[model samples]
Target: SHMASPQFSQQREEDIYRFLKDNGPQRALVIAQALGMRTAKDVNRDLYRMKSRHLLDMDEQSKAWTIYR
Candidate 1:
């Protein structure tokens, strides 16, 4: 009932985190593309969303995402 703290709106957060965890790190573009548009609104927004919440780590220069943190 809208009580839980939902992240990025859905389950793709797992796929996103898992991919980063396995691959070490990746750009949002590649992550979203590899995910093949199955996510809500390209997944890039959510990438930043997760980054904001500190759920994932990002490289400022290359824009790669990592779940190592």
Candidate 2:
């Protein structure tokens, strides 16, 4: 099926959550570097994907991200 949705790896998904689990709130770039992502854009994409799943949310002003249940 050619469904329109973000594509992310399982490891990437887990890594994002694990990092957040430990670090509390962090900027996309910070999470990107911690997870060895290519760039902040990658992290931003993952954040957006996670947001779609209701797994996380970001603050526009501070650029910090928070996880949800």
Candidate 3:
């Protein structure tokens, strides 16, 4: 049986949040690499979800995402 996955795991969310908090701005793929995510696709999904929540701001032209305190 496969374990259920939350929209975003608390630890994973926190990891991304903390990284961006310190790093200022980064691309989804870089964020994934920094956090050791299984794939950048999953990180992109998280980015989209966080973007919808207004927790993250993404620039489509630059593909850069920033988190503001």
Candidate 4:
């Protein structure tokens, strides 16, 4: 079974980025891992996808990326 829904990837990425943006950078991986996810790979994959689309901001200083809004 798939761990995540393909159709929900974009929506999920939004929610996840919102979660990170509001809660702060560290919380991004924390929340995902709290849901029993392994590594930040899945989230990062989506984050990078968003980054590539210019839909979000990946800050080197923050060590993470977040939705630009």
What are the lDDT figures for the candidates, one per model?
A: 0.73, 0.80, 0.75, 0.60
Q: Backbone clashes per model, in order? A: 0, 0, 0, 0
The candidate scoring highest on TM-score is 2
Once superposed on the true structure, which residue ranges of model 1 sit more than 4 Å away at CA? 1-9, 38-41
Candidate 3 least-lDDT 10 residues? 4-13
Please give, for residues 4-39, the per-residue lDDT of candidate 1 as tens digits.
Answer: 343445677867877777787888777887788754
lDDT score, candidate 4, position 16: 63
Clashes of 1: 0
Which scores greater on TM-score, model 2 or model 3?
Answer: 2
Model 4 lDDT on a 0 to 1 scale: 0.60
Question: Residue-wise lDDT of candidate 2 within 1-69, one digit each (tens)?
Answer: 679333446787778877897979888888999888767898887787887887788888898888765
Model 2 CA lDDT for position 39: 75
lDDT winner between candidates 2 and 4: 2
Overlapping backbone residue pairs in candidate 2 total 0
Q: Please list all clashing residue pairs in model 2, or write none if there are none.
A: none
Kindly provide the TM-score of model 1 when superposed on the true structure, using C-alpha atoms.
0.70
User: By TM-score, is 1 or 3 better?
Assistant: 3
